Write a protein that binds this ligand. Sequence first.
Ligand SMILES: O=C1CCCC(O)=C1C(=O)c1ccc2c(c1)N(Cc1ccc(C(F)(F)F)cc1)C(=O)CS2
Ligand SMILES: O=C1CCCC(O)=C1C(=O)c1ccc2c(c1)N(Cc1ccc(C(F)(F)F)cc1)C(=O)CS2
Ligand SMILES: [Co+2]
Ligand SMILES: [Co+2]
Lengths: 381, 381
Amino acid sequence: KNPKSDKFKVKRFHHIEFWCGDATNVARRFSWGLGMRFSAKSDLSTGNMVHASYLLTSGDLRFLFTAPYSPSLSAGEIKPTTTASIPSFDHGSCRSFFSSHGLGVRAVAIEVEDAESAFSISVANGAIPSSPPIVLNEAVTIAEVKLYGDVVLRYVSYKAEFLPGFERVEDASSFPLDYGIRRLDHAVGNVPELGPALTYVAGFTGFHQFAEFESGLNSAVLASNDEMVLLPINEPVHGTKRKSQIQTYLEHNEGAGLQHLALMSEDIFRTLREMRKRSSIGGFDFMPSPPPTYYQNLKKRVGDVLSDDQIKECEELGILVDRDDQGTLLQIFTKPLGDRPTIFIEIIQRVGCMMYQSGGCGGFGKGNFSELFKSIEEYEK
Amino acid sequence: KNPKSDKFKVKRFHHIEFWCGDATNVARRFSWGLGMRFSAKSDLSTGNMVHASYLLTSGDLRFLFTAPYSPSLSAGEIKPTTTASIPSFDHGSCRSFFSSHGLGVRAVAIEVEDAESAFSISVANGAIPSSPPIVLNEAVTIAEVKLYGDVVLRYVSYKAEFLPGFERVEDASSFPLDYGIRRLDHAVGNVPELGPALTYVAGFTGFHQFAEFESGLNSAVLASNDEMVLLPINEPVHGTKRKSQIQTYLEHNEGAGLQHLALMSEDIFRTLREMRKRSSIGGFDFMPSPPPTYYQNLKKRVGDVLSDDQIKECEELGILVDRDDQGTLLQIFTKPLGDRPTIFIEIIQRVGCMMYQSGGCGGFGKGNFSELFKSIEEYEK
Ligand SMILES: O=C1CCCC(O)=C1C(=O)c1ccc2c(c1)N(Cc1ccc(C(F)(F)F)cc1)C(=O)CS2
Ligand SMILES: O=C1CCCC(O)=C1C(=O)c1ccc2c(c1)N(Cc1ccc(C(F)(F)F)cc1)C(=O)CS2
Ligand SMILES: [Co+2]
Ligand SMILES: [Co+2]
């Protein structure tokens, strides 16, 4: 059931912004590890005396990396005279965020029809304001409300190239890397209490709960009208045999925040081949692969969707598979992206639900909790 | 002239430590960009609840990258019960350093015969103490005095594997990258006033001034007894036509600090081939190359040291060449390593002064100031 209750018109995920101590090194690491090209910049070379911001793209996926300069460079500015290209940026907020949480997502940005309206309607319906609507070069409007922890939900709307004040990156510095990643599928938050977090976010967005089908979590998913914006939220379950890794997240992150970004690939086999080639030469590492019993058990579960060779290809790459009532999911998870056991990345490709593919086809992999345990005990043998 | 006036026995450069906001991403970027292997770690997985520290090595060159965890992880510890492997580390100092300066060098570490003696003699001769001598596992002693700005000169001495509490990195995570870099040749600081900085450092070390042979700087070089530890220092020259980039450094860095690290290569052609292949895929960028007139003029200057093809190879890679009375220098410079126009890297190889090669053979390239200007005006033509 989908009541289509959005309180304002939402389009798609637009970008994800990381707050960094040094944007250059994080962006260069992520570019090589994920196959994303350098697409836009706003920094000293474009007249921005406030923050360094670098944009990576792969298909429609947009990762923004931002770090503050010395405040002394902009000490004479006021907001009316700012050289910052992102008017919501604040040196103190950024330093406090990074000192508190380490490297992580500050903003989950969605494109909307009218960011000013989205902001006003959100706040009228309980959203905590974070940055008011600001019109950039009479062309783009940006606004921000609190999502959870120190993560903001950012609204961007365009009258008609990322943001005014950003410059497209010279061809020489823009190597055309591409490992097949094409868009953000979903963005997941960890909170201490799922109930109040859901009530808050669904309260100000009108997002509805997305249909689903001992491991230390309870989760639910909020979705926009066409279910293309997907915001799962997890809470820890206490007193379990193994300590909840949602709780470990909350401790190491100093509270609620973004747990993982799931990136859709148009060819998850190619994406994982390319990412795994680079794991130990600057890229990303992956979680340990499931035992062979897991891939033996895939025959019974998805033998009508994947051939033997395609299943063997999943085994070679450590890819997980899940299925719900409408579709099939291929997924795999990275180790944490930085020093802390907090944020990680999921790579996903979905099979089925063709009408374009409908959002969330195959679910989010909750069936793999039981299938992994069963596989581990069976391989124990 | 070399008076050999060291006040304590100094051996070689031992390591350089960067203070980071996220050590993982900087280390992975540097590893790929410079061809350095992951060699040791001290972090949550080794029982360190205080800081994440990752060691990269190439030959004898050792780069350490360190970032603080949440203080809450170690809030019950005191110094007698610390789980930090580097006892001089302090969360507040590290966060303050990185917020003030951005990514940069905190420690220039030299191996000495007796770090406790080196510390005591240094302080008795004017050194400002930063961290007292601490004996680690009855095997290594570490001590720190202020060098310039917030950079410390770190003394390490071994009774007899980086530091106790560090673990060697698993083979799978340790890809054997190598682009030919073999050791730290020299480490250069920028200060507002060269005179007082030289008097201070030479005062507490006994290091002597190293023999040399409009551009915005005055510089001098301090050297140990065998001139293998080399510490140049620059000050800005004001009122020049082009603003001194020493002064730009001081402004963007919020004061004095480490300007560049010069890394000796055993094959600078191979090093530059490998680094330039990776510039736009996560590695380091290089300064713009000199005009062809510069390489035409190399015939007269070093035609007795390099063949035509070797000179042409220099031109293909943008390598600079200088010569003093004893030897010849090949050098090239990266663009800044991070967001701020502050720290950069030099790659160097020296030709001559064979007895082993004596330290500083060929100088530091000061002749390239005039040779570059002349080349630029001649190519203007
Ligand atoms: O989990 C949820 C809730 C719903 C919205 C969401 O998108 C997801 C996932 O993406 C997801 C689903 C199933 C699995 C999985 C991730 N993971 C990674 C992993 C390890 C550990 C823990 C934790 F310790 F926190 F419980 C959670 C996740 C696997 O390794 C195979 S099972
Ligand atoms: O400079 C010094 C002093 C002595 C100890 C030292 O090791 C060095 C060098 O390594 C060195 C020497 C000559 C050159 C050079 C670097 N560089 C980079 C560069 C650009 C700009 C400015 C500045 F703007 F600050 F003046 C300084 C340096 C070149 O590009 C070719 S000339
Ligand atoms: Co997921
Ligand atoms: Co130099």
